[PDB]
Amino acid sequence: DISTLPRVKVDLVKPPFVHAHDQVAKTGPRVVEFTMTIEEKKLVIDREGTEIHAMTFNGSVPGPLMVVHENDYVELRLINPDTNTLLHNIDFHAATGALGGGALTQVNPGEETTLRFKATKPGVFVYHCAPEGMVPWHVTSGMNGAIMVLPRDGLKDEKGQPLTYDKIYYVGEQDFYVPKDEAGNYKKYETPGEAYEDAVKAMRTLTPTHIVFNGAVGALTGDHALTAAVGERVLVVHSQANRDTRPHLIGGHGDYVWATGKFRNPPDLDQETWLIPGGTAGAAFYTFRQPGVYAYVNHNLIEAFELGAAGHFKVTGEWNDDLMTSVVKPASM
Amino acid sequence: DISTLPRVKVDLVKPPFVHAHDQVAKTGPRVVEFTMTIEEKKLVIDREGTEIHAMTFNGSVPGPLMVVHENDYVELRLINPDTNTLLHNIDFHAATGALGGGALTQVNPGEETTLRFKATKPGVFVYHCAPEGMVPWHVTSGMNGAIMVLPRDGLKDEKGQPLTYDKIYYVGEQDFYVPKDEAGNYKKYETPGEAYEDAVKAMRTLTPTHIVFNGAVGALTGDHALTAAVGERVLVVHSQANRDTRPHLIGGHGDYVWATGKFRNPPDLDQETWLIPGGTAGAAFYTFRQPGVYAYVNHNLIEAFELGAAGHFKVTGEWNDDLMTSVVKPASM
Amino acid sequence: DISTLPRVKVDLVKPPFVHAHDQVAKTGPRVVEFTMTIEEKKLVIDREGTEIHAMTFNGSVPGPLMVVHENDYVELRLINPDTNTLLHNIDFHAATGALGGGALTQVNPGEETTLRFKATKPGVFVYHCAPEGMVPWHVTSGMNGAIMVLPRDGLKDEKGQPLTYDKIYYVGEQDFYVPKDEAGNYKKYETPGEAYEDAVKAMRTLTPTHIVFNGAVGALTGDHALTAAVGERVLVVHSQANRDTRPHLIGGHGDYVWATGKFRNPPDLDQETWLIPGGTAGAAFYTFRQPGVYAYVNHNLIEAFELGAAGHFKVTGEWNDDLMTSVVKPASM
Ligand SMILES: O=N[O-]
Ligand SMILES: O=N[O-]
Ligand SMILES: O=N[O-]
Ligand SMILES: [Cu+2]
Ligand SMILES: [Cu+2]
Ligand SMILES: [Cu+2]
Ligand SMILES: [Cu+2]
Ligand SMILES: [Cu+2]
Ligand SMILES: [Cu+2]
């Protein structure tokens, strides 16, 4: 009887950070309560100042990472304020039935709903809006996030031994399709309805104009670079709700990788690069061994370095000359 | 000596249905006899009435699913009636030698041939036409199907326990490249030879105009929705002879997935979405737990909902409020 | 102390051949010394005579396959002669730290450098140039190769039994983006700097103009077809530094496949086709069972047969009619 279970209220944080949780469940199954507020907002997505009408959960692209344990119940209060103009809903790939919740969560501006589902399968999973007839438009406007469902005894390696992270980040990768005129310049629009047909036309090209992490070119760089220390164990959760990606830590590896994100499967070891299919979340575990700057990219390097799918780690600690050294520094001879 | 083996004649059915077979082999190895007749035909592939010159095995896109057991012999009589205009052949990815049979099966209109091969490896596999110099044109005109080679003791899970399906469907996913004029409208053509160069030009864009299941937008919807009941175990075989796909059951999962289709490998568990590479068949096993409508898509949702790669299940039975419920239905407050 | 280790000098060979090595390590850990010379050169990449300004390691596209064992040290002397015009560097996906070596290997024309790293993880791995701000331009100009890091006890199957190859080939697959004018014809350029913006524009289309093995359409055909004999065990290493590929042996299989190339993972068995993500090397083991001509392709068959991603094997030996036979040769009736 679900009414006899503990309830725990989660307070979300903005990606790439992740709300507090325990890897190994410190309680029995719980009803874990989340609230998200839909926000339609203008976002500047590149260095040129290109501004799109984003559709967000909780103000961010991606939406925040939700974390529960296997056989917890997720109870989400979804709020669509009357400052928004569109109908929205939510589909959890973690959930079973009713299009992952989308059939039960249709909220007009000025409405709210509360969905509950049982998180019966452990893994990282995409969640996304999906209103009948307008599904790719909402998703490719940024209206997607992820949920992690941890096994109750935490993560395990390919031999059944514990894998415990010290830090976790969530990288949401977003393909945008900003409509272009014949000359190649981006168009702007007076209303979503006046934008819709051109959004459909842009999407049908199948060719993104931008591919970004955390909502914009350069979002995970500078003062917002990801951080770690030598010897820290770091889990990077990575989602892509609509297109394939091929993540790569430049100067590192995925020591243990669930490329399609489901923890009952043994991870792939020692990956350079892995394929997260569109419509999937994946997760990579790495122990840093060298200090300095790393880039974290989609290893279609055009997508990375021309279209935006690149972030950075700044790693502190000591350099290991056994692992790598310059024997003779660049010089003329 | 193959002449001492039983012969069994199969009578194929139109996709997404699958001819009768036994999961666990009820006989020793057999010569399993199939006949397919090539049919060049006009097909309407979208709601707008776009009509292409399809190249089919047995009248359908995809061609029918053939089913045998490991170390059976497949003996295919392939008929190219003189009502057709082109040379055709067949390559089985299941087979060993002679380009998978393509080098031995070249049939002009008014010819037939009979190929035999030993099905030495268990899995689902693509078959497709492949005439030297015109290979992608035939394949992307719809001239591809799949063959399932079951292990003689049926399917097994990641621990070696039986997995037995109650129902099986075959979803063939087809990328078409309908040539377009400068304005973006589809062209039509008086002869295959007059169409060929424009077909090559359209293909070289690498950008499909349509991506469909069972030969047309909406083919697996309405009166042709796939069906199941709560508690039924369903195997969905999915092929894509030319491009990657990323299948997803909206509101469900792949409980056990052979993403690259080969049954000697343990399946991936609890998948949301998986990557079937172009040139591959994959297979997903799911036990339905909730009634209602499901969509089954390529989770590039543009490909799904704008270009055609979406079908439906209609599932009967009782709703499980433990697994999912609306706590508070959408309302204004 | 690395100075007490044996040093061994390798002399590289041109792809698709591979320098001499031992599968099972016949010594303890070594410092394995390689030298590569960067060469900017014009290359004709298709049958039409299309000529690009290639950026190569050691004169070839791909660069040569380097082979070491796990926990050897790779010591590479990288030479950028003053006959070249650009700055170059090298990132090893096999290595840990400093962007895989790229931060430590920046060489102007007329400079050289020597990098050492410890090959701590077994697998096939991409190496590629990656100069800050110009990374995809160098990679998609052909400036990438691969390194194999063998386990010290050689390769093993999914049960821990030895897999020993008789022959090894390296197939490097290269996506090129040759800039096109409005009419669709390729442009040429007077200087790299005058070419750069158009190269960026061509790349941002995400649509390759050419996809080739060993540097050109048809490179692995005719007098340069790959060879084998019936019963020989053949490892094909395949890299793609920038885009996904889906390799397939037409008429064969990957008996054992490390699709994402890392040998501590059990291989996938009996693959028809597999997905090597962009930014990855993979490796397929096959034992030939039939003589004759095979094609080895990217199984986007447009990419294969229209854009160049196809090579051939010529296999000697006896035909096995049990495995495949024509029962009735094509005839009219
Ligand atoms: O490893 N990044 O090119
Ligand atoms: O789960 N389909 O978006
Ligand atoms: O198997 N090659 O189409
Ligand atoms: Cu929405
Ligand atoms: Cu979805
Ligand atoms: Cu044909
Ligand atoms: Cu094929
Ligand atoms: Cu370079
Ligand atoms: Cu790289």
B138 is in an annotated binding site: yes
Q: C96 vs A207: CB contact, 8 Å cut-off?
A: no
Query: Pick from A96, A123, A280: which is nearest to B324 by CB?
Result: A96
Per annotation, catalytic residue among C66, C129, C134, C148: C129
Q: B280 vs C299: CB contact, 8 Å cut-off?
A: yes
Neighbouring residues of B74: CB distance < 8 A, sequence distance ≥ 6: B32, B34, B66, B68, B92, B94, B95, B115, B116, B117, B118, B119, B147
The tokens for B170 are 């075959």
Instruction: Give yes or no for a contact between B226 and B16, defined as CB atoms under 8 angstroms apart.
Output: yes
Return the sign of the alpha-carbon dihedral for residues C35, C40, C41, C42.
Answer: positive
Ordered by start, the domain boundaries in chain B are 1-151, 152-318
The counts of H helices and E strands in chain B are 3, 22
Residue C39, burial from CB neighbour count under 10 angstroms (0-12, 13-18, 19+): middle
The C-alpha angle with vertex B126 and arms to B121 and B129, in degrees rounded to 5, equals: 125
Would you give the DSSP letter of residue A196? H
Q: How many CB pairs under 8 A join B and C?
A: 173
Check if B88 is active-site: yes
Ligand 3: nearest atom to the Cα of B99 = 1
Check if B238 is active-site: no
Neighbouring residues of A197: CB distance < 8 A, sequence distance ≥ 6: none
Which residue numbers come right before each break in chain A (C to N over 2.5 Å)? none
Distance in Å, CA C67 to ligand 4 centroid: 51
Ligand 3 in reach of C225 Cβ (< 6 A): no
Distance in Å, CA A244 to ligand 8 centroid: 27
Q: Which candidate in C91, C106, C115, C180 is best for mutational testing of the A interface (most A CBs within 10 A)?
A: C115
Q: How many CB pairs under 8 A join A and B?
A: 173
Return the sign of the alpha-carbon dihedral for residues C262, C263, C268, C272.
Answer: positive
The tokens for B61 are 């896109």
Distance in Å, CA B99 to ligand 7 centroid: 8
Q: B136 vs C302: CB contact, 8 Å cut-off?
A: yes
Q: Enumerate neighbours of B (3 or more CB pairs within 8 A).
A: A, C
Instruction: Give yes or no for a contact between A78 and A112, defined as CB atoms under 8 angstroms apart.
Output: yes
Q: How distant, in Å, are the alpha carbons of B104, B112, C287 from that of C330? A: 8, 5, 29
Per annotation, catalytic residue among A53, A69, A128, A238: A128
**Which residues surround the ion ligand 8 when the cut-off is CB under 5 Å?**
C 55, 88, 129, 138, 143
- The number of beta carbons lying within 10 Å of the beta carbon of residue C151 is 17
Instruction: Give yes or no for a contact between B66 and B17, defined as CB atoms under 8 angstroms apart.
Output: no
Query: Pick from C95, C113, C139: which is nearest to A330 by CB?
Result: C113
* Beta-bridge partners for A313: A226, A294
Distance in Å, CA C167 to ligand 4 centroid: 55
**Alpha-helix runs per DSSP H in chain A:** 135-140, 192-204, 301-305
Check if A138 is active-site: yes
* Beta-bridge partners for B115: B76, C326
Residue of chain C whose alpha carbon sits nearest to that of B266: C268
Q: A295 vs C122: CB contact, 8 Å cut-off?
A: no
Instruction: Give yes or no for a contact between B56 and B84, defined as CB atoms under 8 angstroms apart.
Output: no
Check if B91 is active-site: yes
Report d(CA C178, CA C145) in Å as an integer. Answer: 20
Ligand 3 in reach of C250 Cβ (< 6 A): yes
End-to-end alpha-carbon separation of chain C, Å? 78
Ligand 1: nearest atom to the Cα of C135 = 3
Residue of chain C whose alpha carbon sits nearest to that of B75: C327
Q: Which candidate in C71, C206, C276 is best for mutational testing of the A interface (most A CBs within 10 A)?
A: C206
Distance in Å, CA C63 to ligand 2 centroid: 41
Check if A128 is active-site: yes
The tokens for B67 are 């089913």
- DSSP per-residue string spanning C46-112: STT--EEEEEEETTBSSPPEEEEETT-EEEEEEEE-TT--S-B--EETTS-SGGGGGGG--B-TTEE
Instruction: Give yes or no for a contact between A309 and A297, defined as CB atoms under 8 angstroms apart.
Output: yes
Centroid of chain to Cα A285: 15
Instruction: Take atom 1 of ligand 1 and give the residue whose Cα is closest.
Output: A250
Instruction: Give yes or no for a contact between B280 and B128, defined as CB atoms under 8 angstroms apart.
Output: no
End-to-end alpha-carbon separation of chain B, Å? 78
The tokens for C34 are 């390689």
Neighbouring residues of A193: CB distance < 8 A, sequence distance ≥ 6: none
Given the DSSP bridges, would you call strands A155-156 and A73-80 parallel, antiparallel or unpaired? unpaired
Ligand 3 in reach of B130 Cβ (< 6 A): yes
Would you give the DSSP letter of residue A277? -
Given the DSSP bridges, would you call strands A144-150 and A123-128 parallel, antiparallel or unpaired? antiparallel
Question: Order of strands across the sheet with B254-258?
Answer: B210-213, B167-176, B233-240, B280-287, B254-258, B268-271
Instruction: Give yes or no for a contact between B42 and B181, defined as CB atoms under 8 angstroms apart.
Output: no
Q: How distant, in Å, are the alpha carbons of C77, C105, C218 from that of C116? A: 9, 10, 36
Ligand 3: nearest atom to the Cα of C272 = 1
Q: How distant, in Å, are the alpha carbons of A124, A133, A284 from that of A157? A: 16, 42, 12
Q: How far is A332 from chain C (nearest CA, A)?
A: 4
Ligand 1: nearest atom to the Cα of C139 = 3
Report d(CA C16, CA C254) in Å as an integer. Answer: 18
Q: A328 vs C139: CB contact, 8 Å cut-off?
A: no
Q: B204 vs C306: CB contact, 8 Å cut-off?
A: yes
Closest CA to B37 of B66, B83, B79: B79
Provide the b/e sequence for C42-51 (b: ≥16 CB within 10 Å).
ebebbeeebe
Per annotation, catalytic residue among A21, A37, A227, A299: A299
Centroid of chain to Cα A252: 20
Provide the b/e sequence for A102-135 (b: ≥16 CB within 10 Å).
bbbbbbebebbbbbbbbbbbbbbbbbbbbbeebb
Would you give the DSSP letter of residue A201? H
Ligand 3 in reach of B40 Cβ (< 6 A): no
Q: A278 vs B246: CB contact, 8 Å cut-off?
A: yes
Per annotation, catalytic residue among B91, B173, B175, B303: B91
Contact list, C275 vs chain B (CB under 8 Å): 244, 260, 275, 277
- CATH 2.60.40.420 at C152-318, yes or no: yes
Neighbouring residues of A243: CB distance < 8 A, sequence distance ≥ 6: A175, A208, A211, A278, B300
Residue of chain C whose alpha carbon sits nearest to that of B120: C323
Q: How far is B11 from chain A (nearest CA, A)?
A: 36
Report d(CA A102, CA B297) in Å as an integer. Answer: 15
* Beta-bridge partners for C297: C248, C310
Provide the b/e sequence for C107-122 (b: ≥16 CB within 10 Å).
bebebbbbbbbbbbbb
Closest CA to C107 of C127, C74, C130: C130
Neighbouring residues of B308: CB distance < 8 A, sequence distance ≥ 6: B45, B46, B210, B211, B212, B213, B216, B217, B218
Ligand 1 in reach of A87 Cβ (< 6 A): no
Q: B326 vs A104: CB contact, 8 Å cut-off?
A: yes
Contact list, C207 vs chain B (CB under 8 Å): 205-207
Check if C138 is active-site: yes
Centroid of chain to Cα B104: 23
Report d(CA B136, CA B134) in Å as an integer. Answer: 6
Residue of chain B whose alpha carbon sits nearest to that of A274: B275
Contact list, A322 vs chain C (CB under 8 Å): 2, 118
Per annotation, catalytic residue among B53, B69, B128, B253: B128
Report d(CA C68, CA C151) in Å as an integer. Answer: 9
Report d(CA C203, CA C186) in Å as an integer. Answer: 14
Would you give the DSSP letter of residue C196? H
- The number of beta carbons lying within 10 Å of the beta carbon of residue B164 is 11
State which H helix or E strand residue B140 sits in: helix B135-140
Residue for token pair 């706590």: B327
Q: A327 vs C140: CB contact, 8 Å cut-off?
A: no
The C-alpha angle with vertex B84 and arms to B201 and B61, in degrees rounded to 5, equals: 65
Domain B1-151: give its CATH code: 2.60.40.420
Check if C273 is active-site: yes
Query: Pick from C125, C207, C265: which is nearest to A272 by CB?
Result: C125
Neighbouring residues of B187: CB distance < 8 A, sequence distance ≥ 6: B178, B179, B180, B181, B198
Q: A113 vs B300: CB contact, 8 Å cut-off?
A: no
Contact list, B133 vs chain C (CB under 8 Å): 305
The C-alpha angle with vertex A133 and arms to A131 and A135, in degrees rounded to 5, equals: 50
Check if A27 is active-site: no
Amino acid at C247: P
Instruction: Give yes or no for a contact between A249 and A294, defined as CB atoms under 8 angstroms apart.
Output: yes
Closest CA to B320 of C210, A257, A2, C267: A2
